[PDB]
DNA sequence: GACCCACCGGAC
DNA sequence: AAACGTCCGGTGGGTC
């Protein structure tokens, strides 16, 4: 490209280099723009940001986030990564997209700007005629990038002193459990090393090996194996407790307080828009979509996510979302009637699992039933189900039979989806988002059947993702006009932050927007709560 | 110091 | 572990 002086003309493609991948923490090392066969390189990147009207190019959202961090309203526009991701969601990184559609991802701003230009032209042309993918781009993914940039730059408040105190308490309990393990083993070793633990459990203590690991064939020490051995030796129960506490301390309690940003005083995740095979978002650096919630200690961690003073958190979460989606996609009359009658299949599975009235189901029980319902739906074996429910093999196989007998149109939909996936090579969501699954025709059965479970999961999970994304796009301008913030997305859940005096109005409105995002053959119901902390808002 | 591999486990 | 799916991250073990 011919070099031309900064600034670039309006509408040019942007290229940029960060000192590190996280835009909230990155130094902007270089900034360039390309257009009309010309490349423009900025003498001072920070100053030159003020010249741009929007971020148009590869990884546009990251540049927009850094602009917001600097107090600049620079919205993200076109991003050929989003085009590539709609054509094939295995298009997840710039390195791969470049090597597929006509360029090379380097470390220089100007080359990245020129690459963004050539890649947009090529990919936009590949979408000519793909009307449904173009609708998803214009109506969901491109506007969604702007919502996500604002969420990333806003962040979430964390009770740091709380988590600091909690680390010290959890350490004390870890030390006691460790001493108990070493004593029950008769000697110390590195309880964090699964190799050392394997030798101690299965060679020294002679416990029976339940299963083996995939690539190296070691005797597994997974929670499931230990669950199976929970009564075969008292040490197992203690190892299960040690694993729980060390997992939560090392992954959440200790690292999260060290990620507070100095200028915002808040914690900033990244919402990756081209990272999953189904159209879900992902979250990283840190992942705020897998914050603990299940166990009592997990709940204490979740309580550390709090509202700014004078604000409240609002948490909203679709009810039984993939089951409602399945009802719509399959057309099963029986499953539809379940939701038109206000029934709860997680509660009903819970009542059967634990043999208690629906009134007696607690959150820990409902979660367990949740895993059963989706485990069975997406192809869990009677063998594993027998082990999860702790019932005879026969009684687990009888549950899988009843489950699908209740909704006969579902297996019919599974087979039509797989058959169409074999013919077309891809499966698709309600909105036409595609996932290519060529192993539906694999000649090795185990491989093929794994591909089948991925293939008919995708329309259900991806439709639910499409609906959530569309709701975010519709809800975001309403929130800005009410003075409220969108903070987090957790797949079928939003966490908002609102002025105390407006929290109730925001909760009501967000619930309506979410439930009415796109009418299906069943109603979408959204559970909403308000609190000073993430856990209390979910109650 | 950066990176990889395998496994293990958090959430939805 | 096992014929649930989708992700990301810590640890040990290892290399360069
Ligand atoms: N395959 C699979 N999908 C899962 C699993 N857990 C969650 N999902 C998928 C399927 C779920 O529909 C979706 C959202 O998860 P939630 O909000 O935690 N549960 P839901 O919406 O069903 O029930 P309610 O909100 O009334 O508590 O994530 C699982 O173990 N397996
Ligand atoms: Mn839900
Ligand atoms: Mn949820």
Would you say the CB of residue A370 lies under 6 angstroms from ligand 1?
A: yes
Query: Measured from the CB, is A351 under 7 Å from any atom of strand C?
Result: no
Residue A367's alpha-carbon distances to A40, A378, A386, A495, in angstroms, are 55, 17, 18, 20
A191 and A246, same domain (yes or no): yes
Q: Are residues A87 and A17 in the same domain?
A: yes
For A378, the token pair is 């997406």
Distance from Cα A197 to the centre of ligand 1, integer Å: 33
Q: For a pocket test of ligand 1, which of A321, A327, A384, A464 has the largest count of ligand atoms closer than 8 A to its C-beta?
A: A321
| End residue of a domain, out of A411, A446, A464 | A464
Q: Are residue A230 and residue A333 in the same domain, yes or no?
A: no
Atom 10, ligand 1: which residue's CA is nearest?
A: A322
Judge contact between A372 and A382, C-beta under 8 A: no
Residue A342: which region, alpha, beta or left (left: phi > 0; alpha: psi -120 to 50)? left
Going by C-beta distance under 8 Å and a sequence separation of 6 or more, which residues neighbour residue A77? A54, A55, A56, A60, A142
The owner of tokens 């499953």 is A335
d(CA A459, CA A325) in angstroms, rounded, equals 9
Among A464, A498, A524, the domain-final residue is: A464
Last residue of a domain, one of A101, A127, A153: A153
Counting Cα atoms < 13 Å in the Cβ hemisphere of A506 gives 30
- Residue A388: give the domain boundaries: 321-464
Q: How far is the CA of A224 from the C1' of C11 (A)?
A: 19
Q: What is the domain count for chain A?
A: 4
CB A388 within 8 A of CB A375: yes
Q: Which nucleotides of C are covered by protein (CB under 7 A)?
A: 1-13
Query: Could you give the 3-state DSSP secondary structure of residue A529?
Result: strand
Place of tokens 């997209």: A97
DSSP string covering A41-105: E-SSHHHHHTT-SSB-STTHHHHHHHHHHTT----B---HHHHHHHH-TT--SHHHHHHHHT---
Q: Does the nearest atom of strand C lie within 7 Å of A64's Cβ?
A: no
Q: How was this structure determined?
A: X-ray
Instruction: Provide the 8-state DSSP code for A259.
Output: G
In the structure encoding, which two tokens stand for residue A377, read together? Answer: 């739906």
Cβ-based neighbours of A396, under 8 Å, separated by 6 or more: A382, A383, A385, A386, A389
The structure tokens 């990333």 sit at A152
In a shared domain, residues A441 and A531: no
**Cβ-based neighbour number of residue A132 at 10 Å:** 14
Alpha-carbon distance A273 to A472, whole Å? 13
- In this structure, which residue's CA is closest to atom 1 in ligand 1? A374
Asked whether A61 and A76 are in contact (CB, 8 A), the reply is yes
Task: Decide if A291 contacts A301 (C-beta within 8 A).
Answer: yes
Q: Which of A276, A322, A328, A339 to mutate to test the pocket of ligand 1 (most atoms within 8 A of CB)?
A: A322
User: CB < 7 Å to strand C — which of 419-458 in chain A?
Assistant: 449-450, 453-454, 457-458
Give CA–CA dist A349/A405, Å, rounded: 15
Q: Which atom of ligand 1 is nearest to the CA of A457?
A: 1
**Nearest CA residue ID for atom 29, ligand 1:** A371
Residue A208 sits in a domain whose CATH number is: 1.20.1060.10
Tell if A234 CB is < 7 Å from nucleic strand C. no
Residues A508 and A365 both lie in one domain: no
Q: Is the CB of A209 under 7 A from strand C?
A: no
Q: Could you give the CA distance from residue A402 to residue A503 in angstroms, rounded to a whole number?
A: 44
Same domain, A359 and A493: no
Chain B: nucleotides below 7 Å from protein CB are: 5-12
Same domain? A129 vs A243: no
Q: What does the alpha-carbon distance between residue A424 and residue A427 come to, in Å, rounded to a whole number?
A: 8
Q: Is A310 left (phi over 0), alpha (psi -120 to 50) or beta?
A: left
Question: Between the CA of A25 and the C1' of C16, what is the distance in angstroms?
Answer: 28
Q: Indicate whether A513 and A524 sit together in one domain.
A: yes
Take residue A421 and report the two structure tokens written for it.
Answer: 């996936």
Dihedral through CA A303, CA A304, CA A308, CA A309, nearest 10?
A: 80
Q: Which chain residues have CB less than 5 Å from ligand 2, an ion?
A: A 317-318, 321, 492
In Å, how far are A36, A75, A250 from A40, measured between CA atoms?
Answer: 11, 20, 45
Indicate if A143 and A224 belong to the same structural domain: no
- Give me the residue label for tokens 């979250």: A283
> Are A56 and A189 members of one domain?
no
Q: What's the rounded Cα separation, in Å, for the pair A378 and A143?
A: 32
Please say whether the beta carbons of A373 and A323 come within 8 A. Answer: yes
**Angle between the N-to-C axes of helices A393-406 and A382-389, in degrees from 0 to 180, rounded to the nearest 10:** 110
- Among A476, A525, A534, CA closest to A148: A476
- Tokens 């058959």 sit on residue: A419
Going edge to edge, which strands form the sheet with A493-499? Answer: A485-489, A493-499, A311-318, A526-531
Ligand 3 center to residue A320 CA distance, Å? Answer: 9
Contact, A317 vs A538, CB < 8 A?
yes
Phi/psi at A259 (5° precision)? -110, 10
Helices A445-482, A503-515: inter-axial angle, 10-degree rounding: 140
**CATH number of the domain within which A126 lies:** 3.30.420.10
| CA–C1' A471–B4 (A) | 39
Distance from residue A38's CA to nucleotide B11's C1', rounded to whole Å: 46
- Same-domain pairing of A75 and A142: yes
Interhelix angle A321-330/A333-340, nearest 10 degrees: 140
> A471: CA distance to ligand 2 center in Å?
14
Shared-domain flag, residues A48 and A99: yes
């Amino acid at each position: 490209l011919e070099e031309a002086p900064w600034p670039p003309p309006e509408g040019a493609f942007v290229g940029f280099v960060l000192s590190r991948k996280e835009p909230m923490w990155a130094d902007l090392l270089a900034l360039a723009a390309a257009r009309g066969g010309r490349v423009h390189r900025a003498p001072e990147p920070y100053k030159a940001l003020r010249d741009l009207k929007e971020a148009r190019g590869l990884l546009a959202k990251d540049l927009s986030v850094l602009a917001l961090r600097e107090g600049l309203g620079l919205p993200p526009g076109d991003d050929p990564m989003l085009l590539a991701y709609l054509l094939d969601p295995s298009n997840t990184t710039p390195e791969g997209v470049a090597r597929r559609y006509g360029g090379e991802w380097t470390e220089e701003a100007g080359e990245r700007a020129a690459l963004s230009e050539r890649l947009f032209a090529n990919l936009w042309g590949r979408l000519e005629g793909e009307e449904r993918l173009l609708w998803l781009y214009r109506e969901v993914e491109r506007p969604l990038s702007a919502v996500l940039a604002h969420m990333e730059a806003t962040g979430v408040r964390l009770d740091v002193a709380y988590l600091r105190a909690l680390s010290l308490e959890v350490a004390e309990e870890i030390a006691r459990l460790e001493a108990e393990v070493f004593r029950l083993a008769g000697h110390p070793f590195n309880l964090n090393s699964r190799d050392q633990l394997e030798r101690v459990l299965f060679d020294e203590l002679g416990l029976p090996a339940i299963g083996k690991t995939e690539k190296t064939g070691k005797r597994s020490t997974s929670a499931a194996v230990l669950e199976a051995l929970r009564e075969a030796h008292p040490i197992v129960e203690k190892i299960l407790q040690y694993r729980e506490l060390t997992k939560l301390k090392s992954t959440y309690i200790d690292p999260l307080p060290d990620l507070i940003h100095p200028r915002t005083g808040r914690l900033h995740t990244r919402f990756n828009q081209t990272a999953t095979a189904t159209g879900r978002l992902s979250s990283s650096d840190p992942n705020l979509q897998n914050i603990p919630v299940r166990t009592p200690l997990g709940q204490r961690i979740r309580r550390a996510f709090i509202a700014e003073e004078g604000w409240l958190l609002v948490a909203l979460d679709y009810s039984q979302i993939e089951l409602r989606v399945l009802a719509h996609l399959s057309g099963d009359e029986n499953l539809i009637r379940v939701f038109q009658e206000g029934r709860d299949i997680h509660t009903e599975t819970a009542s059967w699992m634990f043999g208690v009235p629906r009134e007696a189901v607690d959150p820990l029980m409902r979660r367990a039933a949740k895993t059963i319902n989706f485990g069975v739906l997406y192809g869990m074996s009677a063998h594993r189900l027998s082990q999860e429910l702790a019932i005879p093999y026969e009684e687990a196989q009888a549950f899988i039979e009843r489950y699908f007998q209740s909704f006969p149109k579902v297996r019919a939909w599974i087979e039509k989806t797989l058959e169409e996936g074999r013919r077309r090579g891809y499966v698709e969501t309600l909105f036409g988002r595609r996932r290519y699954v060529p192993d539906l025709e694999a000649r090795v059965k185990s491989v093929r059947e794994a591909a089948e479970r991925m293939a008919f999961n995708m329309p259900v999970q991806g439709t639910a993702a499409d609906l959530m994304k569309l709701a975010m796009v519709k809800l975001f301008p309403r929130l800005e006009e009410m003075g409220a913030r969108m903070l987090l997305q957790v797949h079928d859940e939003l966490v908002l932050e609102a002025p105390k005096e407006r929290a109730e109005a925001v909760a009501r409105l967000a619930k309506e927007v979410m439930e009415g995002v796109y009418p299906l053959a069943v109603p979408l119901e959204v559970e909403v709560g308000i609190g000073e902390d993430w856990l209390s808002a979910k109650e």
